[PDB]
Structures are given as C-alpha cells and as structure tokens.
Amino acid sequence: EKTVVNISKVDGMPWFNRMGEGVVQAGKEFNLNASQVGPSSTDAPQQVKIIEDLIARKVDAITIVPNDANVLEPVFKKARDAGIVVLTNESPGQPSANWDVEIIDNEKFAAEYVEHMAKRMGGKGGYVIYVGSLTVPQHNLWADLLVKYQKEHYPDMHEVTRRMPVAESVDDSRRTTLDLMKTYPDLKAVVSFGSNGPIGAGRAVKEKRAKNKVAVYGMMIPSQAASLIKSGDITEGITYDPATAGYALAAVASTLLNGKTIEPGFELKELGKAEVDSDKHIIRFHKVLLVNKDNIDSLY
C-alpha cells in the first residue's frame, strides 16, 4: 500500500490524538499505510528532522500541521524534489505544499468569534488573544482577521495587550489570564486558538470566581474542556474536529497518489464539496463546531 505519514505540532495533546484517529480511519478507507508522528516539542526543527527521515524512507506522502511555515520550506522543497507529496493543514499559502487543507472558512470563523464575544459584552470592553507562538501561521492569520473584524464592527471593543504566545501551555495560559484580570478591570473575554489555552484561562477564571464578567472562547477538544464548560468557566468552544483534518489530509493524499488532479468541484464522500483556490492551492471545507453546555455530551 501507499505510505502516508501525518506530522502533528507536538505529541501528548488530546487535540492531536483526535487528529490521529482521523488519519488512521482514512488509512482504512483508502487502502493506505497511514500513521501519525508527534514531535517531542513545538520547536520547528523537530518537524524538519522527522521529514528528513521520511524522505530517506521514501514515503509516498507527508502531511503536516506546521509549527513555522518558513522554517519548513527548505525540507518541503527537498521532499517535493524527491517526488513526495507534501500537504499542510493550518498553513494556507505554504509555498512548497501541493495543497493546504482547511476545515473552516478563515473569514467566517473570525466573524463568529467576534459576534459571539460582542453579544455577551454588549459590544464594549477589553479582550485578549492567545496564540501558540508568535510565528505559527494559522493562529496568527486567524488573530489578524479577528482584530480586523472587531475594528470594523465594534469600535468600543479593544485588545488589552497584543497577542500572547501561550496557547499551547495550560500553565502559561493560566498565569497570563491571572495577570491580565488583575491588570485590566475591563477585560471581558479571553480567546485562545491553541487547545490548552481555554483550559488554563478557564482555571484562572474559576479560581478568581470571575465567570460572570470574564468569558473564555477558543479551540478545544470537548472532553478535555468538559469540566470547565459545565461549570461555566469556559464559555464556548468555536472550533472543529481535528479528526476531520487528519482524514481530509490523507484523503487528498490518496487522490493525488492515484494520479488525479484537484480542481474546483473536488469533493470527499464523507465531508462534501470543498472550495478550491487553485491560485493559492487551498482546499477549504466548512465544518465549524460550537461547543456549549447544550451539546458537550454529544462530543468526543
């Protein structure tokens, strides 16, 4: 069978474990020898090393959620030059990827964050954004759009500080949330695009008994966030199922390895039709998931 290997941002995360379930499922469905490698840390050279080993192994396709788009470019070009398909998730515009695959529409996702935040604080107040790092591509693109949307809808909202690179750490997210709540009495919402961020922020909000005024929104695995969703310390997840991303990556790899070419009109039985931007080589699905007390038990 054709060999497909997915590479997460880092091992030891419920988010990426869920992704791997989708990879393994696609391997069954598409007759692939599929696997997922979790790096030992989020430092991008660890992903480069894994990719060098996969090129040496001469695998058929490498799929990856990059920690840094630019750090990986040379090794992605080395893979392509070797005849290996390179696919990303969370890296729209990655120059050497055959395609980037996304599970939500960026514009819509940002809007949903701001509208949900604005409703609860009456369109006025402070907020902050947590990102996984200052260079991770997709978190920063989402943050940029969220702020831009905010400024052209709710001028009485504002970032209390520039974005904080804490979203992959419960500790760092908790500490930052405690600090910012003490500093900014008008802080009313914390947004995290990393999945550990709402856990840390939610724990801080719980400790200070602050859930009435300080809302917490973000990306999350529902089961990991369940205790805090149920106690109201996490207000809402605005996210997607990363198993769908893992699956879609491997499904697109299958298409390409079978000699087919991706163009507008592309569809996956299990997902539906994607939008396909041939100029930027981005395949988008529209599968945003809202995680609230009302559906927390219906999820993974």
Closer to Cl ion by CB, 164 or 282: give it: 164
Distance of alpha carbon 194 from alpha carbon 168, whole angstroms? 5
Closer to Cl ion by CB, 149 or 247: give it: 247
Q: Are 205 and 284 in contact (CB under 8 A)?
A: no
Shortest Å distance, C-beta 227 to Cl ion: 5
Listed residue (69, 114, 121) closest to 90, CA to CA: 69
Shortest Å distance, C-beta 8 to Cl ion: 4
Closer to Cl ion by CB, 93 or 232: give it: 232
Closer to Cl ion by CB, 16 or 154: give it: 16
Shortest Å distance, C-beta 225 to Cl ion: 7
Shortest Å distance, C-beta 228 to Cl ion: 5
Q: Which residue is nearest to Cl ion (CB)?
A: 38
Shortest Å distance, C-beta 11 to Cl ion: 5
User: Which pairs from 51-57 meet CB under 8 Å and 24+ separation?
Assistant: 51/7, 51/75, 51/76, 51/78, 51/79, 52/78, 54/5, 54/79, 54/84, 55/79, 55/82, 55/84, 57/3
Shortest Å distance, C-beta 196 to Cl ion: 10
Closer to Cl ion by CB, 112 or 168: give it: 168
Listed residue (127, 130, 152, 149) closest to 139, CA to CA: 130
Residues engaged in binding Cl ion (CB under 5 A): 8, 11, 16, 38, 174, 203, 227
- CA end-to-end distance (rounded Å), the chain: 30
Distance of CA 18 to the CA centre of its chain: 12
Please name the amino acid found at residue 73. Answer: E
Closer to Cl ion by CB, 81 or 171: give it: 171
